[PDB]
Structure formats: structure tokens, C-alpha cells
Design a protein around this nucleic acid. Structure first.
Lengths: 226, 215
RNA sequence: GGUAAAACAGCCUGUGGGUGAAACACACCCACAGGGCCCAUUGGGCGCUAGCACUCUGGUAUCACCGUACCUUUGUGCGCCUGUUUUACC
């Protein structure tokens, strides 16, 4: 849509380290709005982090981050920031920037939001995933529909994206929540259901992205014969 | 002292077409400076209501907000399948800003038995050294489901893990994956691998299986 | 914004309400409380003044009385300065 907030800066960081998140604005000028950061620990609720007011530059902070975090606003780049120092395990969360809308149009509601970026505070090291196919068969066929998938194993940290046929194939798709293994690595699988008659003609490819380890894998999933 | 927004219920289930009420209770006056948000799995919150009772532009009129002193209510006049989400109230009266703990709204629908599919480990995985057997339970309701792994008719314990999708925004169903993890040396000590599923939509439990080396 | 013509307000200090792309800060508007200075003091005045007109209260010089001129003070209208708003044209 018209107004967008595009964030960056996330990733793995050592405990006691630092990260700067960016919030790039489009379709409006951050100088006329208040800009907020809100986080969401995985599985948990929204937690407001900080805000910066227009025309005064006044800044405000949740007590859990006061003195460690610094919000700022570079109007000449139309970009806001969050500088995060002395990060603790409990700072792991998805971080959102949000525009407080115009007073006369949406009160103090947060009318636009970034798509979020994940900060993992961990002393563990980054490892790319292994992508294995989940082939369709007569043992994944039922009533003209067949299931095939990709098994995305042994990676850290979250997240991974999985699309299918470069995003040409969307319906019937299930990408499951990652599961944390006893090794401390994550794995998940993405499955898709397709017309069984298409298993001969149509190529199915799962695309797996794991930015923390620069990994970007395309893996063709072809039928086996059970 | 920071203002608390006490939100209730923590979750609810409602059938499609039901009127849904969510309540938020401020620990001190917040005037009308209250917003409601809808957050869908994987996605940023979206604004529904501002100034406690004003409908954000673009938001369907089946959503509405009301205020009575420090009690704030979000209402869905007729719940739709796409209204599956977690809903949050927020106070913007004083700093620091505060959100309620959220309310996860679930859709109640008719029973749907899962379709059950099994996936033998790939050749590519085996020569790296391990073996994952995947059991897929697809598009079932309700979420409760039993997955039993039998290896040559011997039950497994602590040898598998399950993951469940969020409720589907269109048909209100669930899908689940159970994956049996086994070393290659162990995987080749047995022949039959069976996923056994119990679910309320199934008049009797459904078993899918395969023999090793013959997939 | 430019031009032209108006309106409303303007001693100080706080406070509150609002509006300005606006939670605070800032700017402006609108109220309230308290205070200061001037006066002819149960009350009235105060954006600023070396000026102007008139008036009024006290003086000072002429001076028998009367009358005249200047000062001062009460106001009114100017002159001078600021803020906001409105209209017409460009």
C-alpha cells in the first residue's frame, strides 16, 4: 500500500553486544508523526519499547530498556532507528516500528507498521540448514490429491522462509512452525498438496532462505514410486 | 506507576456468526486514548479501533469499540473465518505505552478428520548420517490429535516431535506434522515404520506405513 | 505570498482549555487566578512616547479682580509598535 515502513538490522547478536535497527519510511515524512518501536518475544504479547515525538524530538522508553536503548529519527533520510546496547537473552523478540497516525484521522492509534525483524540474543553460532525432499507417492496420494514437501533441518537461528516454485505456487501450502531440537538447532518442514495427475508434468521446487547463514537453496522434489 | 491494561478472556472459541466480546480494564483513567489491534500469525498488528470507539478507515464495520469509564470493549458483531487472530488493546494516555496480554480468537467448526500421509527419509539425508520419517495430518478439526509411531510394531517414546499450523483463515482447519528422528545405523535395524493417528473425526484410528528400502 | 481594506486583542506571572501534520516541548488563540504601576482611589487606567488636537484635576507665572500662557493629571481622538483573524483582487 501507500505508506510503508521497511525495517532492517536484525539478526543474531552476542549477549552484551549491540545492534542498530532501521525503519525506512515511504509515502510520508517521519517529521510530522510520532514513531514507535514495539517488540514481541516469540510466543508472547506485544511490548512497547520506545517512541519519538514530532517537532520536539522528545523520546520515551519502557523501563525494561531505559538506559540501554536509544531511539532516533534521521529526517533527511526519512528513516528512524533503534540502537540496542547491552542486549540480554530477554531482548530476543520480533521488533516492529510503527507510525502513530494523524491526530484528527486516527487518534493515537498506530495506523502503519513495519513487517518486523527478529533479534536473537544468543552466544550460539549460526548454522545453515539442510534441505531434504519429501517425495509424493501412492503413500501420499488420496482422491486425486497428492502431498509433497521439503524438510528443512539443522539450522540456527530462526527464521527460514520457504516458498514453492519461486512463489508461483501458494494454495495448498503448509509451512509448519519450527521445532527446537535437543541439539539446539531448529528444523521445520513445508508441505504442499497438488493434483496427483500433475506429478508427471509439473516440476515442484521448494525455495529455502536462511539469511543468518547466507543460505538460499532451491531443491526439486520429484515423485518416488512406493 | 505504569498503567496496566488487563485483558480478558485470554482466549475464546466461537462459532462463525457469533457475536464476540473482548474486554480491557485500565488500572487508572486513560480517558478515551485506547486502541485495538488485530494480529494474524506471522504478521504485524493491524489497527481496528482508535480513541476507544472510532473505526479505523478500511476496517469492516462488524468491528466496534465502546467505553464505560475504565472498561473498554471490542465487539465483533458476527465472527467470520478470517477473523481468526490475536486481538490487543493498547493505552496511549501516558508513557510508557501499555498493551493488554492479548486475546486469541479461535473458530469453532464442524468436525473434519485428517488426511494422513507418510514420507520415508530421502536418500540424500541417509548418506549424511540420519533419517527422518514424516507423518502429515492434513486439514483436520479440532486440533487435538494423537500420533503414535510404531517401528516393527514397537511403540516409540521420545523419538519424535510434532508441529501444528495455526488455524486456517478460510476453512478453519489445522494441519500437523510428526517427524520421527533416527540414526542411519538404527534406521536400518528395522523394516516397518508406521504412523498411527487417532482423531475425533475418525471412527477408528488410521495407520499409514512403509517398509524400509522399498519406497 | 503580494496589494488594499477591516476586525479583535496587547502591564506582569502562573494555570487551564483548544488549535497548529502537535500526548511533551514550541507557536498561536481563548479563559481563569494572583500580582505590579498610574489616578481625581468604595472606583478607574496601564502595547509605546521628547509629539498633535481637545478636555478634565491640580499647580506656576503674569496678576487688584477678571482674564491669558505654560506645566501636570483624568479621559477621548490621533501618532507609533506588536500578535492573531477576516474580506476583495492578483
Amino acid at each position: 500500500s501507500e505508506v510503508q515502513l521497511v525495517e532492517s538490522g536484525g539478526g543474531l547478536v552476542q549477549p552484551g553486544g549491540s545492534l542498530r535497527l532501521s525503519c525506512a519510511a515511504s509515502g510520508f515524512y517521519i517529521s510530522y508523526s510520532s514513531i514507535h518501536w514495539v517488540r514481541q518475544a516469540p510466543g508472547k504479547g506485544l511490548e512497547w519499547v520506545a517512541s519519538i515525538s514530532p517537532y520536539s524530538g522528545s523520546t520515551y522508553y519502557a523501563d525494561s530498556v531505559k538506559g540501554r536503548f536509544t531511539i532516533s529519527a534521521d529526517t533527511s533520510k526519512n528513516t528512524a532507528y533503534l540502537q540496542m546496547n547491552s542486549l540480554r537473552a530477554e531482548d530476543t523478540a520480533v521488533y516492529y516500528c510503527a507510525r502513530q497516525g494523524y491526530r484528527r484521522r486516527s487518534g493515537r492509534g498506530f495506523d502503519y507498521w513495519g513487517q518486523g525483524t527478529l533479534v536473537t540474543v544468543s552466544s550460539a553460532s549460526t548454522k545453515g540448514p539442510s534441505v531434504f525432499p519429501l517425495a509424493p507417492s501412492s503413500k501420499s496420494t488420496s482422491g486425486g490429491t497428492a502431498a509433497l514437501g521439503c524438510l528443512v533441518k539443522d539450522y540456527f537461528p530462526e527464521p527460514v522462509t520457504v516458498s514453492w516454485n519461486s512463489g508461483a505456487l501458494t494454495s495448498g501450502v503448509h509451512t509448519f512452525p519450527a521445532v527446537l531440537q535437543s541439539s539446539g538447532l531448529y528444523s521445520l518442514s513445508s508441505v504442499v498438496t497438488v493434483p496427483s495427475s500433475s506429478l508427471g508434468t509439473q516440476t515442484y521446487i521448494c525455495n529455502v532462505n536462511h539469511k543468518p547463514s547466507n543460505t538460499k537453496v532451491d531443491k526439486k522434489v520429484e515423485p518416488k514410486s512406493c | 506507576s505504569d498503567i496496566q491494561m488487563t485483558q480478558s478472556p485470554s482466549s475464546l472459541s466461537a462459532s462463525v456468526g457469533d457475536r464476540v466480546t473482548i474486554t480491557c480494564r485500565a488500572s487508572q483513567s486513560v480517558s478515551s486514548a485506547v486502541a485495538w489491534y488485530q494480529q494474524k500469525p506471522g504478521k504485524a498488528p493491524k489497527l481496528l479501533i482508535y480513541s476507544a470507539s472510532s473505526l479505523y478507515s478500511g476496517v469492516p464495520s462488524r468491528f466496534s469499540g465502546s467505553r464505560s469509564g475504565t472498561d473498554f470493549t471490542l465487539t465483533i458483531s458476527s465472527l467470520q473465518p478470517e477473523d481468526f487472530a490475536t486481538y490487543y488493546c493498547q493505552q496511549s494516555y501516558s508513557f510508557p505505552s501499555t498493551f493488554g496480554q492479548g486475546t486469541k480468537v479461535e473458530i469453532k467448526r464442524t468436525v473434519a478428520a485428517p488426511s494422513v500421509f507418510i514420507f520415508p527419509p530421502s536418500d540424500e539425508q541417509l548418506k549424511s548420517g540420519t533419517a527422518s520419517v514424516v507423518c502429515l495430518l492434513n486439514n483436520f478439526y479440532p486440533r487435538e490429535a494423537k500420533v503414535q509411531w510404531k517401528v516393527d510394531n514397537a511403540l516409540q517414546s521420545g523419538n519424535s516431535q510434532e508441529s501444528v499450523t495455526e488455524q486456517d483463515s478460510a476453512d478453519s482447519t489445522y494441519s500437523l506434522s510428526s517427524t520421527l528422528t533416527l540414526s542411519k545405523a538404527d534406521y536400518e535395524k528395522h523394516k516397518v515404520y508406521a504412523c498411527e493417528v487417532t482423531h475425533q473425526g475418525l471412527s477408528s484410528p488410521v495407520t499409514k506405513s512403509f517398509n524400509r528400502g522399498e519406497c
